[PDB]
Every structure is written in structure tokens, then in C-alpha cells.
Amino acid sequence: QIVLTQSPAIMSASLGDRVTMTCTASSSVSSSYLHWYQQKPGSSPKLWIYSTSNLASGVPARFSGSGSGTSYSLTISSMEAEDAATYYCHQFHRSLTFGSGTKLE
Amino acid sequence: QIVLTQSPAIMSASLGDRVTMTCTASSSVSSSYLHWYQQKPGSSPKLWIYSTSNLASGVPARFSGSGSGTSYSLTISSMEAEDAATYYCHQFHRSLTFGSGTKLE
Amino acid sequence: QIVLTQSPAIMSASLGDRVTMTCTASSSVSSSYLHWYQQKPGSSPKLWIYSTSNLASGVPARFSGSGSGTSYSLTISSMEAEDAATYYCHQFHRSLTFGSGTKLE
Amino acid sequence: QIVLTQSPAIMSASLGDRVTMTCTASSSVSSSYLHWYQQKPGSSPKLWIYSTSNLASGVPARFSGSGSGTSYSLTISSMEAEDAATYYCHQFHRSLTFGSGTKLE
Amino acid sequence: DVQLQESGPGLVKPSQSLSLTCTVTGYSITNNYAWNWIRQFPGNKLEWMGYINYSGTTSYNPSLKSRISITRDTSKNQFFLQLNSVTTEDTATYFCVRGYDYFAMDYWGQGTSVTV
Amino acid sequence: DVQLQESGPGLVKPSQSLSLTCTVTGYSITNNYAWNWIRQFPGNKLEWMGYINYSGTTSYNPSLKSRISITRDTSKNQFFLQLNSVTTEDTATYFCVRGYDYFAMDYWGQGTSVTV
Amino acid sequence: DVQLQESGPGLVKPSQSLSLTCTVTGYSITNNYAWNWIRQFPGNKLEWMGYINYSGTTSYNPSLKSRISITRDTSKNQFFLQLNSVTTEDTATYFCVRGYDYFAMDYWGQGTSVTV
Amino acid sequence: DVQLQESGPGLVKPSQSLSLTCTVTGYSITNNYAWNWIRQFPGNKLEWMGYINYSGTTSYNPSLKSRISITRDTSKNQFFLQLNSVTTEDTATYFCVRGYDYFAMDYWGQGTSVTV
Amino acid sequence: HPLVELGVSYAALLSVIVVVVEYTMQLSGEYLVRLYLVDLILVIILWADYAYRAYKSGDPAGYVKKTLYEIPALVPAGLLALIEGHLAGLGLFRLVRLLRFLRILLIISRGSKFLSAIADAADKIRFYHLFGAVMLTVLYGAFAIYIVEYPDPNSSIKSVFDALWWAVVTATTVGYGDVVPATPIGKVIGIAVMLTGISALTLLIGTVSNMFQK
Amino acid sequence: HPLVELGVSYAALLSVIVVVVEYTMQLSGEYLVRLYLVDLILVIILWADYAYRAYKSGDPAGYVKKTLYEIPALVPAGLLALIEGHLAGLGLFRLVRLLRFLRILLIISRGSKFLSAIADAADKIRFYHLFGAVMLTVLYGAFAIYIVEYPDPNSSIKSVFDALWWAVVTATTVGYGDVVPATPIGKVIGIAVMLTGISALTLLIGTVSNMFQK
Amino acid sequence: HPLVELGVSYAALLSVIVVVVEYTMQLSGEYLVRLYLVDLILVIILWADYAYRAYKSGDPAGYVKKTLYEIPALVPAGLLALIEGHLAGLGLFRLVRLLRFLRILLIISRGSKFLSAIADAADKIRFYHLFGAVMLTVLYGAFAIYIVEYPDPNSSIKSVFDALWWAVVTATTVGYGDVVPATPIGKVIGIAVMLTGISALTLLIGTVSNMFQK
Amino acid sequence: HPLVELGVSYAALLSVIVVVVEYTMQLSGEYLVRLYLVDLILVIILWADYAYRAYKSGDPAGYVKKTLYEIPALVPAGLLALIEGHLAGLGLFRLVRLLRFLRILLIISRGSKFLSAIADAADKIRFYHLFGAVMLTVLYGAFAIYIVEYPDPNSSIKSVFDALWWAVVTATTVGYGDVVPATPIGKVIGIAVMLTGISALTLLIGTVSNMFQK
Ligand SMILES: [K+]
Ligand SMILES: [K+]
Ligand SMILES: [K+]
Ligand SMILES: [K+]
């Protein structure tokens, strides 16, 4: 039932900088049911980080997730021309929900 | 149940005399169920007079029966060499019974 | 239940005159259930005017019916040698009934 | 239930002497249910004297049993090289039981 | 083109029941309308006795009911008039008629004379 | 043509039952009338024992009942006399007879001599 | 080889029900995991509607429940989305996804544009 | 010419049940007499355990009852000894015998050594 | 071994029933009484069917005899043959024949005549015919208890009705909480009653059922 | 011979039942009433099926009429034909035809439409169809006692329910200790009731059972 | 999910019955006891059949022994074999043979002799033979409750009769308002009793019915 | 024409039952719950079969686990799958597979293993399997009244037992004078209960009977 806050709703940076994002759940969660999906506008959604730390098979090791209790992150190390995507973070406590999407520019 | 008395138990006479016999029932009877049977010693019994007056098909009109209430008779008119037979009189009130037999000599 | 009065019970007139009859119901009726039958003595009855204002198939337009509430008529315009018939008027309020018959001569 | 005492538990003698044994039941018995079995160590037991006074089919007449009430014997007359066997005496009053065995040497 | 065809006895002794039979042709006793038994006394008067209908149900003249009843031959296409204990008054003519809309016999049978 | 044909033993030891058999010819044991078993003692006296009838039902002498009974061979056309515990008194002659109207044996069997 | 293949209409009048159809290939709707119907609003937001599962049982979004339901074609291997009384807000994009472990759609359908 | 034929294991661990099998030839376990299971301890002593009989019914040694039972193979002609929780004391030799008149095993089986 | 004394005592009770039921057979296997109650019930129906006209047909003696075709019918069934008994007993064997023809004529009349209203089905007789024994037995039953219950003091069973009720009730598998033997003896024979009444009353409903669907 | 008086008196009681049950037939052999309660019960289900929305659909008159496809369905069954009676009686024979088409259309609609509730073809109609007569009879029965029990003073039977209960109960072979005729007369007709209710109620459970084997 | 606790608790009760009924089988599948009550009931009939002459045959000891052909018949059935037990137990195995011949002779005598009561061949034995198990079970049942009802304080069930009554009654589908377990435990096992008694008591009436069709 | 108002009112009551019974179908046609109570009752038997050794096997924890071959057996039936629900709900879909194999192994073990004691007959399952639904329904029934009877003031029905009793009793055609709905509503649904319980409970005894003769 809890709501999600993917700040910044929108944000920018440049090639090389350690990009960061944050999923702040109004209420507690569960280190397990916390996942991250990357969406390239126009295309279809795609899971990117599941269970906080591990990444999808088609994901570059450059990514890393950090969270617990009320906050979790999608931290990186360097951007590209690809990373320009709307990253979403959904949880599953009472029911299912999603976030605003820490859009990357 | 009543008993019968065929007097005389034994008796005689001669050819020509109007032979007579009497059936005296200890108790009342019924003009109907009163019958007379003639038996020639050695042979088999044979009905002779039924319902007081009428006679068997093989009986000579010389016979006649007279009775009512407590007494009935087998009166004749003349004997023969045949008539020498033991005449019986049976009744049927409660059950069936017979008489001593007004034996003729 | 109610009774009917077809006056005149008997009446005359002759070729040309506008013959008239009248069905006077002791009680009210119903413009619908009011009908007129014509009977030629010897033959069988024959419906002639149904539902107060409309006539049978085999009936000459010369006829006309007028009634409402307690009285109805079978008015004509001219007689013939045929019209010489006993016209009846029956109604249906509580049950079924008929009239004395406005006999024509 | 009752117990048995086959004395001597062990005993000797030699060819010629009238060997003797004794079954002393702590309690009374029954001349019938008293029997004597002979066992040659190594082999299998073998009934030898049944019903107090009568012997088995394969038994030499040299044997004889004497008993009643509380005591019974297996007396002989002469030993052999065969008789060298552990003779047992069992009874049946309440239940079934056996004896220590009047071992022969 | 329809047509009722009445037929029947025409003479009986008092207390004896009257049995009338009227056939129907070119139609059916089950379609629509009702079926009547309206007699015509010697006084040329008309007295409606009763009716059975397309469905079956029936109703009689409130006076005669205590002494009558009616039926029909669903298969052969006919109806039956039954009057119990026929006295003298019953002496009259009989008719079977197709009770058209709002009740109005639109087809009459020729006729039958019954004497008592 | 009616004719009873009695037959049977004619000698038994006391306490032993007596079994009599009488056939019938020219008629039937079921039509009408009754069927009797009237014996004749050595004293030429006559004692009626009992009867079965055209239908089947039966009745005996009020004294002997306690020691007798009767039956019939519906098929072969015969009836059966059965006396239990035959003492000396029973020594006599036996007869089977057609019990005609108002009870009157109108046909007698020849006879059978029974000794005890 | 798992692959969801979503398909459907994409235009309807209010109060009218929406009927979506998504096929599945290289797998089965009965093995394991759950099957979702998560739509993407014009605001690129994502709202999960509900899911049926390998067994059959289902659960929806606590808000939409009052106006939705889902099913499946056990034989042809497909599931069905049903929304009753589609207002304007429902205008968005639709997606069917394989709900992998701990709930994480690990396979998405291309997409379908629904207009209201 | 009769003859009992005993056979069986001869080694087990404590608390484990002992299952003995003795066949019979030249006779039947249902005719007459009783069938015993009398063991011989290491002390050459003899202890009768129990018996089944020609009919079937059985009785055991009042002490062992709480821990034993017996049966038979009515068809194959054999009986079965069953002891539950075999401790050390049970270490001995076993024998099956034909219980002749007044109880007197008139036919002994060769033997079997069981160690615990 | 003690139970054999207690257990065999039960056998005795369980044994009587074997007869009470066995006897019930020897009372329903009579081609007579069975076939007589049937022809007496069909007429009782006429005893109120045609002899039930208002108090104006129940006053004209002339009109009942007037119908000399019905009089012989509205008479009995076997209560005509019942008389035959007090006749044959009085050796009036002659008169017996005439009365035999009367029953013969009556069975052809009623039998065939009634079968005129049987135009519906050929089984319109197999029914009652069966309904008979079924009922007879129940009677016999009610009577059984009647004897062993009527005299009893505080025994809910009194009239032949009350004992008859209990019969049907326990034979129709219904049973309520009103009719029940007080003396264990009644309860005893009861075990027989129902053991019978049921089985039979069932063969009844069996056809009743089948006939019901047509 | 005295027993014939006592024994025949019983025959009379045993005789009435023959009619009470015979009559029960002439009340369930009507292809009508039977086929009318069925089409009236299926709709009562709709009377709470579609006309049972919260107090917001039960206020919008516009929306009930809105569904002009259901209104005709949620009307009666035969209570449309019932009217036809007060019509034909008033010679409105013309209007009769139109109303005849309405019942024709209604039977095709409901009949076929309802048969669309899959998983059972021609298996689910034989059911209710039968459930009808079965129930009708029980009714007739309850009514039978109703008449002869309602007026009685201390008679555990009062309402049509209480008399109806006794009916089912004694027809379902159940019977308790609450419902039971006080006047022997009720007990009488009862013998008929159960003699019927049972046999029928059984033919019911017969199919109920078989069908239940799914 | 809480219901699984409450719902499974029911399973337990529903489970015991599975045994109480299963056990009822292991008590009627004995070719013995079954075939022993039958030959003991047939004789109890003789115990009052031939040993019931007035007080003048009941005094002559000489005449009972006089009929040395009946004495062996009017003795027991198995109460002769019952003895065989106290014999074989006492190893009198020799004497066993002789007593075995006695039962052999007795079964040929009675068996064949009794079968001489004409009009029913092989039809009358299948009856009682079956009547046996049927009754046995009911007994076992009555006994079941007997144990769990006799001790109870205010428990309408007392004697073996009262507990036996309840058995038949609930097994004959009758049931009244007198016999009923007070302790829910009795009510429990009861569910088993009837689950059994009925099914069996029915197979009984099944043949009773068919046979009754004569 | 007034009766149609009174008579149709009855139709309504007669109508509800049509559903209460129809619904009873949609509760016994589940290849699941049916096949789950069966495998849970067979184990409850083991819950007292092997886990009922004296207070010396009920103290050694080591010996219960010692038999690692039974532990999996003496666990549940579906109370293992019940858990699967609280799992799939928590998307632990991975763990679901493993637990699916456990039920698969358990059904092969118990199924075949138990059928080792089935050497007697192949129907030793068709029985209980059927005994299930039969019982389920009765439950559903008892529950039906339970709801509409428990709250009622002076209502002889209280516990789930008392309401359960009434169920069996009225479903076994037995019925006494103790269990009976006070509120006419209970009496109502009851008509449905028995209309069901009976038919089913009969199909039960049907096989019980047949099986009884072999
Ligand atoms: K009851
Ligand atoms: K019942
Ligand atoms: K009952
Ligand atoms: K009751």
C-alpha cells in the first residue's frame, strides 16, 4: 500500500560521473522484493536490478544497489549514451506499486 | 350332541303286518336333517329315507316316515324277505350321531 | 342478469319507410357488448349488427345502429321482402341475455 | 507355574547297574500330563516316556516309570553307551514347565 | 368459410339427461373465440346456456349450472352439451355458435328440435 | 355313476397311527357335498368321525378331535383318515361316504375291517 | 526463450468493458511464477492491476478490484484482462509480464496503446 | 512318518523382533494336536513359549506373552514364532514340536541356533 | 467363557422374531383373504359413490332396488361367501351351488366392468391387489402389539387406531415420538413388525413410485 | 364370524386413503401448474439476482426500464397468462392472440437463454421439471391436513408452514416429534400423504442422487 | 486460513467413525459366530416346539430320553464345540475327534432334516444365514453404545435392551424420541452404528422384500 | 383468483431451496478439497497409530525423527500445500517448485504404500473418496443451520456438534426429537439439507451395502 518516491524525478550529469538515484519508500519494505527496472522511452520496460544488489543477465557490472528499511539506491560509476533511460523502482509489501522514475537526461 | 334311541333295539313281526319303528331323540331336532338308513348285515349301509318323508330312488312306495320335534317313525304296511334289515336313524343338530338300530327279525 | 325489452315485440310498416326498433336495457350496458341478430323464422339465427356501430359482412349498408347507456336502436331506411325477420338484441354485463325480439311483419 | 527338580542334576554309574532318576514337583501334578524326554547333547530332544507308565515306540522295554502326587521316577535296569543322555521331565498343571535334567554321565 | 354443424337426439323422458353433439369445420375449437350452446324456446325466445373455449375452461348460465355441464372432443373437433333431469320447460330448439369478439355469435348452426 | 372306493390296512399296534385311504370315481372331492369317515363298531353301531369338503375345510367328532385329523389328494381325487394312538375300542369297520343334502350319505363304500 | 505476446483493441466508449489478450510462448501459464497486467499511463507512470498464476488463483490492485477481474485460456496458453466501465483516466499503455521470483517481471511484452 | 522341519535366522540386534519359521511334512497343522515353540537356553534348560493348534487358537507362556505372539500358514502348512524386543537372555536354541495327547511333544525338529 | 451364557440368552429373543415374521408369511400367502379385502374395498367406494345421493334418494326405497343391476354389485365381495360357510356347515350343499354362481357372476361383472375404467392402464389392479397384502401385514402387526400393549397400564397405545398408527408409522419408516411400546415385549415384536412392514410397505411404494412417473 | 364386522370396519379407513392418494394424482398430472411453478421460481431468482443492486439502482426508475431486455423477463411466468383468463372471460378474444405471442417469446427467451448456463445440457431442467410435481404433491398434502388440523383446538399444527413442515418431514421419511395430527382424521389422511409424498419425494432424491454422482 | 484449524478438528471426529465401522466388518466376517447363532436359534424353536408339552410330558424324564433321536438335536449347536475349547486346552486332543464327529452328524441331521420343511429349497437358509451377520452387527453396535452409555448418569440408556433398542431403531432407520446417547461420545459412535446397521439391515430387508413378493 | 397471491408466495420459499441445493453442488465438485480431506483423515489415523506408543516413545524426541521415513508421512496432506499459498502470495515462486515435488512424492508414497494394505480389494479408496463428498455436504448443511440457529435464543441447536448431529440425523433419514430448527428459517434450509444429505448419504450406504456383501 505504501507509496514510492524516486528522486530526482528528473536529473542530469555527464559521461564519467558516478550517477546516483534514490528510492525512498514512505514505509518500510523488504530487502528482497525491492527491484529496479530501466525503461528507454519508446521501447518496452526491462528489469535491471533485482533483490537490491544482483543485476540482470544483460547488465554491465558497473551498476550497484544499496538499500535497507526505508531507502535504497541505484548508484553507478559512469554514464554512457545508453544509460539515458527512465529508471523505475517498485516494491511489494501489502500489494504492488511503482515509483515516479528517476529520469536520466 | 344329542343321543338317539331306536326302539325296539330288536323286534319282530310277520309278512303282511304294518311294521313300525321309532327314533326318539333325547333332544329336539330338525325335520330336515332327519334320515333313515337300511343295513342288511354283511353288506354295506344304504340310505332309505331322507328328510323324514321322501324315499331313496331304489325304495318301494310302501314306506313312510312320520316325525317332528322329539320323535320320528319309519312305519311300513307289509314286510317281506328283504325288509329283514337293521334300520338306522341319524340326526344332525350340534354334530352328527346315529341310533342303536331298530333291528328287524 | 339484467333484462331486455325489444319494443315493439311485434310491429309493421312497408317498402320505403324508415323502419325502426329499440333495445331498452333495464340497466346500463357497454357500447361494445351490444349486438343485433336477425332471424328468419324456420331458419337459423344470424348476427346482423355487432359492436353497436359496425355491421356484418353479408349486410346491406342500409342499416345503422344507435345506442348508449340504456338504449340502442337498429334503425333502417327502407324495408324489403327479406327484412321481414325477427331481429334480436343481446347484451353482456354480468352474464349473457337476449331480447323479446322486435318482430317485423 | 509350579517348578521342577530333576535330581540328581548330574550323576553317574555304569553298564549293568539299575540307573535311577527322580522328578520332584514342588506341587502336586496329574499322572497323565507327566512325561519324560531324552536328549543326546548336540542332537534334538526326543520324547521317551509318556503318561507316567507307557513308553514311546522307539524305546527299549528296559525302561519303567513310577510316580504319583509329588514324585515320579525314570528307573531302568542297565545302562549302555546310548543311555548317556540328559533326561528331562516336564509337567502341565497350571501351565507348562520343564526340569533341570537328570544328566547321565 | 367456417361452419358449425349441429346434430342430436330430439326426444327423451323426464329426469333423463340430454346429450347434444355439434361438429365444427374449417376451424378449430382451440384457436380463439368461445363456443356456445344457446337454445331457442317455443316462444322464439333465446336463452344462452354456456360455453367452453379455445383453451378449455367453461362457464354456464347462473340458473342452469346446478343441472348442467359441457365438454369437447379436442381430437375430432366437437363440443358436448349435457343437461341433467330434463323437465318440460326445456322443450325448445338448440344452437351452437362461434362466440366472436366481445361475444357475438358470428356463425350459427342450422338447428335441432328437442321435445320433452 | 358316483362311487366311493375305500381301502386301507386293517391291523396295527396300540399308540400307532391309523392311515386310511378312500378313492372316489365318477365325481370330484371339490364340487359339492362333504366327505365322511363313519365307522361301524363290532357292536354294529355307527360312529361318525368327521369330514372334509368340496372346498377343503373340515370338522370332526367332538370326542375324537383330540386324537385325529383328515386330509385329501386334491389331484388324485382321494381323502385321508388319520387317527393317532389307536387303542382297542377303535376295533371296528370303516366307511367313506358322500354327504348329500342336509347331510345324508347317499353313497357308501363297501367296507374295511380294522383290527386292534 | 520465454516471451509474452500482448495484443488487443485500443479504443472504446466509456462504461464499456475493456478486453485484453496476451499470449505466451516458450513456457506455460501453469508451471511457476505469476502473470501480470501492469499498465503505463500517459504520464509514463506504471500501475500494476493484478495477476493470475501458475495454479489459477488471482489478486488485483485494491483500488481497481471493484471494477475489474482476470482469467486465462488454460488450453491455448493465454490470460485475459477485463476492466468494467472504462473512463478517461484509464487512457494509457498496457503490458503483460512474467512475475519472476520475489515479484520482478523478468520478461515484458512489447506494448499496446489503449485510447479512451 | 511325520516330521517337523525348523529353520530361521540366528542373529539380531536388541529391540528387534525375532521371526522363526518351521515347516511340517506328512501331516497337517489343522488335523489334531497342538504346535509348540519350546526353546532350549545355553544352560540346556527348556522353556516352552506357546502354541497354536489344529483349529487356530493359541496360548503362550504367561511371562513372555507381554512380548510375543504366534501364527501359521494354513495353506503352505507352517507356523510362525514372533518375539518382540529380543534381549540377551533370549540367547538360546529353538524347537518346534507336535504336542501329542495330554501334551507330550512326540516329534522334535532338528534345531536352530539363535544368538543375541 | 461367561459371555456365552449372556450372549446366548440374547439369541432367544432374536429367535422369537424369526417366527413372528415367519408366521406373517403364512398369513399373506392365502390367495383368498388377500383377494377378498380388495373386492370389498372397491365396493365400499360404491357404498358412498352411488348410495350417497342427497336425502331424497336415501328415502325412496323403490329407487335403489329400482336399479336391480347395481344391488348385486353394492352387496359385498366375500360376505356372500362368508355365508356359504354357515351353509355348507348346515349341509345345505344344494344351495351352495347357486351361491357359487353368484360369486362367479359378480367377479365377471365387477372385474371386467371395473376394467372399463381401467382403459387408462392394465396395471389398475396389480396396484390394489398388492396394496392388499401390504396393508394386511401392517394390520397383523398392529394387532400383534395391540394384544401385548392394550392391557398394559401406562402404555401410550390404546385403541386399535393408536396401535395401527404405530404400525404404519414404523412400517413407513416414519416413526414419531407418540407411538411406542411400553412393555419391552411390544418393543420386541416391534423389531419383527418393522422388519416386515418396512420390506413390504417398500415393495408397495416401489410400484407407487414407478407408477408415479408416467 | 364376528371379526368380519370389526375387520371390515377397518377396510373403510383403509379405503379413504385409496382416494386421497388417487386424487393426489389428478393434481400432479397437469402439464400446466407443473410447468408454471418452474418458470416462476427461475425468475424469483432473478427477482433478487438483478433487482438486488444497492440502494442506488433501487432508486433509478430510469435504470430497470433502461434494461428493456430484462423487464419482460423479470415479470412473471404465467401471471401473464393468469391475466389472459380475466380477458377471455371478457370476450377480449382479440387481445388474447397478442398476449399468446408474449408467452411464446418469453419461453424461447428464458428457455434457450437459461440453457446457456453451460456444463449441463438437458440434464438441468429434467431436474426442476420433476422437482415441481414432487413439491406440488407435498403442498396438496400439507393442505389436506391444513384443512383438518388448523381449526382443531390443541393441535400442534397451525400455520401453513407448520402443516407444510409436517408434510416435507413425513414425506422425506424424516418425521420428528413436533408435527403430528391431533384429530385422528389428520392422522388418517396422513397415511395417504406419506404413502404419496414418500414415493414421489423419493423419485426426486433418486435423480438428485444420480446427478449427485458428479 | 484460520478455518483449517477448526475444519481439521472436525476431520478427527469424522475419522473415528471410519474405524468403528471398519471394525464392524472384522466382527461379521467370521464364517463361525455367524453360522453358530443360526444353528442355535433354529433349536431354541425346538426348545419350545417339542419340549413344550403340558405338565405331563414335562414330568416323565423317561419320555424325552425316550426320544433318543431328538435329544441330540435339542442340545445346543456350538455349545458342544464350545466345550471342545475347554478340552483342546486340556490336551484331551484324543477326545476332540469324537466330538468333531458329533457336530458333523448334527449338521447333516439338522441341515438336511430341516430342509425337509418343503415349499422353499435353498431359498430358506440364505435368509437366516444373512439375518445373522445383520443382527450380529446391530449387537456389536448396541454394545458399542452400551459401554459408553451405561455408566453415564442421566442417560436414557441403561439395560442392554434399551441400548439394543436404540440400535435396531437407528438401524431400521426408525429412531424415536426415547433412545438417544446423552454423552456426545455415544452420539459419535452412533454415527458409525447407523452408518453400518442401516446399510446392512437394508441388505436384509432387501431379500425380505423380494422374498415377500411371493 | 386470490389464491395466486397466496400460492405464489409459497413459490418464493420453494425457490430459495433450489439455490441452497444448487450451491451445494458448486461446493462438492471441487477435485481439490474433496481429495484433500481424504488424505488428511488417513493420516489422522496414523497420528494415533504410530504416534501413540506408551509414555516412553512420547518422550524420546530422537525416536520419531529417528524414523525419517515416517516423518514426511505423519505430516499433513494438503496443510503442506496450504502453506504454498502464503508462499506464492509472497512471490517465493522459486520455493514453490520444491514444495510441489514434496506433495508429488507424498502422494506416490501414501497412495501406493497404503494400497499395500489394499491387497484385499481395489475399491479400498473409492470408498473413502466417496465418503468424503458425502460428509463434506453434511458439514456444509450443518453449517447452514449453524449460522441460522446458533444466535437464536431458545434454539435446541448450539454447538457445531448439535448442529452437526441434526445434519447426520436428518441426512441418515433418522431424525429424533432433540435436534430441530426453532426459527422457521432453519426449518426452511433444512428442507434443502435433507433433500441433499439424504440423496448423497444414500449413494454412500449404497456402496456400503454392496461392499457389505462379499
Ligand atoms: K423419526
Ligand atoms: K426413515
Ligand atoms: K425416521
Ligand atoms: K422422532
PDB file of all heavy atoms in Angstrom, chain B residues 50-61:
ATOM      1  N   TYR B  50     -84.891 -90.004   3.502  1.00  0.00           N
ATOM      2  CA  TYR B  50     -84.252 -88.738   3.851  1.00  0.00           C
ATOM      3  C   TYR B  50     -85.275 -87.622   4.047  1.00  0.00           C
ATOM      4  O   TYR B  50     -86.334 -87.610   3.418  1.00  0.00           O
ATOM      5  CB  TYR B  50     -83.242 -88.328   2.774  1.00  0.00           C
ATOM      6  CG  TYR B  50     -83.841 -87.535   1.640  1.00  0.00           C
ATOM      7  CD1 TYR B  50     -83.558 -86.178   1.495  1.00  0.00           C
ATOM      8  CD2 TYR B  50     -84.712 -88.129   0.731  1.00  0.00           C
ATOM      9  CE1 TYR B  50     -84.130 -85.430   0.474  1.00  0.00           C
ATOM     10  CE2 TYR B  50     -85.290 -87.390  -0.295  1.00  0.00           C
ATOM     11  CZ  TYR B  50     -84.996 -86.041  -0.417  1.00  0.00           C
ATOM     12  OH  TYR B  50     -85.571 -85.301  -1.423  1.00  0.00           O
ATOM     13  N   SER B  51     -84.946 -86.684   4.928  1.00  0.00           N
ATOM     14  CA  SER B  51     -85.820 -85.558   5.230  1.00  0.00           C
ATOM     15  C   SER B  51     -87.207 -86.029   5.689  1.00  0.00           C
ATOM     16  O   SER B  51     -88.228 -85.508   5.248  1.00  0.00           O
ATOM     17  CB  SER B  51     -85.931 -84.647   4.000  1.00  0.00           C
ATOM     18  OG  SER B  51     -86.571 -83.422   4.316  1.00  0.00           O
ATOM     19  N   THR B  52     -87.219 -87.029   6.569  1.00  0.00           N
ATOM     20  CA  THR B  52     -88.447 -87.577   7.151  1.00  0.00           C
ATOM     21  C   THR B  52     -89.406 -88.365   6.256  1.00  0.00           C
ATOM     22  O   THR B  52     -89.711 -89.522   6.541  1.00  0.00           O
ATOM     23  CB  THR B  52     -89.269 -86.454   7.836  1.00  0.00           C
ATOM     24  OG1 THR B  52     -88.450 -85.782   8.799  1.00  0.00           O
ATOM     25  CG2 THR B  52     -90.494 -87.031   8.546  1.00  0.00           C
ATOM     26  N   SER B  53     -89.878 -87.751   5.176  1.00  0.00           N
ATOM     27  CA  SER B  53     -90.844 -88.415   4.304  1.00  0.00           C
ATOM     28  C   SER B  53     -90.373 -89.028   2.982  1.00  0.00           C
ATOM     29  O   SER B  53     -90.643 -90.200   2.718  1.00  0.00           O
ATOM     30  CB  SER B  53     -92.013 -87.464   4.032  1.00  0.00           C
ATOM     31  OG  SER B  53     -91.591 -86.285   3.373  1.00  0.00           O
ATOM     32  N   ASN B  54     -89.678 -88.260   2.152  1.00  0.00           N
ATOM     33  CA  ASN B  54     -89.230 -88.784   0.863  1.00  0.00           C
ATOM     34  C   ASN B  54     -88.312 -89.997   0.981  1.00  0.00           C
ATOM     35  O   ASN B  54     -87.571 -90.135   1.952  1.00  0.00           O
ATOM     36  CB  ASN B  54     -88.553 -87.676   0.059  1.00  0.00           C
ATOM     37  CG  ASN B  54     -89.464 -86.486  -0.158  1.00  0.00           C
ATOM     38  OD1 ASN B  54     -90.614 -86.640  -0.569  1.00  0.00           O
ATOM     39  ND2 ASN B  54     -88.956 -85.291   0.112  1.00  0.00           N
ATOM     40  N   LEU B  55     -88.372 -90.875  -0.015  1.00  0.00           N
ATOM     41  CA  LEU B  55     -87.562 -92.087  -0.029  1.00  0.00           C
ATOM     42  C   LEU B  55     -86.525 -92.112  -1.146  1.00  0.00           C
ATOM     43  O   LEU B  55     -86.630 -91.372  -2.125  1.00  0.00           O
ATOM     44  CB  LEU B  55     -88.471 -93.316  -0.145  1.00  0.00           C
ATOM     45  CG  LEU B  55     -89.704 -93.187  -1.048  1.00  0.00           C
ATOM     46  CD1 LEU B  55     -89.291 -92.805  -2.458  1.00  0.00           C
ATOM     47  CD2 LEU B  55     -90.466 -94.499  -1.053  1.00  0.00           C
ATOM     48  N   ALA B  56     -85.523 -92.974  -0.989  1.00  0.00           N
ATOM     49  CA  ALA B  56     -84.457 -93.117  -1.977  1.00  0.00           C
ATOM     50  C   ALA B  56     -85.050 -93.567  -3.301  1.00  0.00           C
ATOM     51  O   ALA B  56     -86.176 -94.057  -3.348  1.00  0.00           O
ATOM     52  CB  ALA B  56     -83.424 -94.131  -1.498  1.00  0.00           C
ATOM     53  N   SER B  57     -84.284 -93.405  -4.374  1.00  0.00           N
ATOM     54  CA  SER B  57     -84.751 -93.793  -5.697  1.00  0.00           C
ATOM     55  C   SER B  57     -85.070 -95.287  -5.758  1.00  0.00           C
ATOM     56  O   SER B  57     -86.051 -95.690  -6.381  1.00  0.00           O
ATOM     57  CB  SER B  57     -83.698 -93.435  -6.750  1.00  0.00           C
ATOM     58  OG  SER B  57     -84.238 -93.503  -8.060  1.00  0.00           O
ATOM     59  N   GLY B  58     -84.247 -96.101  -5.101  1.00  0.00           N
ATOM     60  CA  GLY B  58     -84.471 -97.537  -5.109  1.00  0.00           C
ATOM     61  C   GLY B  58     -85.298 -98.037  -3.936  1.00  0.00           C
ATOM     62  O   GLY B  58     -85.042 -99.118  -3.403  1.00  0.00           O
ATOM     63  N   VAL B  59     -86.299 -97.258  -3.540  1.00  0.00           N
ATOM     64  CA  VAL B  59     -87.157 -97.623  -2.418  1.00  0.00           C
ATOM     65  C   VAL B  59     -88.627 -97.775  -2.801  1.00  0.00           C
ATOM     66  O   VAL B  59     -89.196 -96.917  -3.475  1.00  0.00           O
ATOM     67  CB  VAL B  59     -87.050 -96.575  -1.287  1.00  0.00           C
ATOM     68  CG1 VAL B  59     -88.134 -96.811  -0.249  1.00  0.00           C
ATOM     69  CG2 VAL B  59     -85.681 -96.656  -0.637  1.00  0.00           C
ATOM     70  N   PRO B  60     -89.262 -98.880  -2.369  1.00  0.00           N
ATOM     71  CA  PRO B  60     -90.673 -99.162  -2.651  1.00  0.00           C
ATOM     72  C   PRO B  60     -91.611 -98.234  -1.877  1.00  0.00           C
ATOM     73  O   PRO B  60     -91.485 -98.077  -0.662  1.00  0.00           O
ATOM     74  CB  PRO B  60     -90.820-100.624  -2.235  1.00  0.00           C
ATOM     75  CG  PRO B  60     -89.843-100.742  -1.112  1.00  0.00           C
ATOM     76  CD  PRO B  60     -88.641-100.009  -1.653  1.00  0.00           C
ATOM     77  N   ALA B  61     -92.550 -97.629  -2.597  1.00  0.00           N
ATOM     78  CA  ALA B  61     -93.510 -96.692  -2.022  1.00  0.00           C
ATOM     79  C   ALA B  61     -94.209 -97.162  -0.749  1.00  0.00           C
ATOM     80  O   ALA B  61     -94.858 -96.366  -0.071  1.00  0.00           O
ATOM     81  CB  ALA B  61     -94.554 -96.325  -3.073  1.00  0.00           C
TER      82      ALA B  61
END
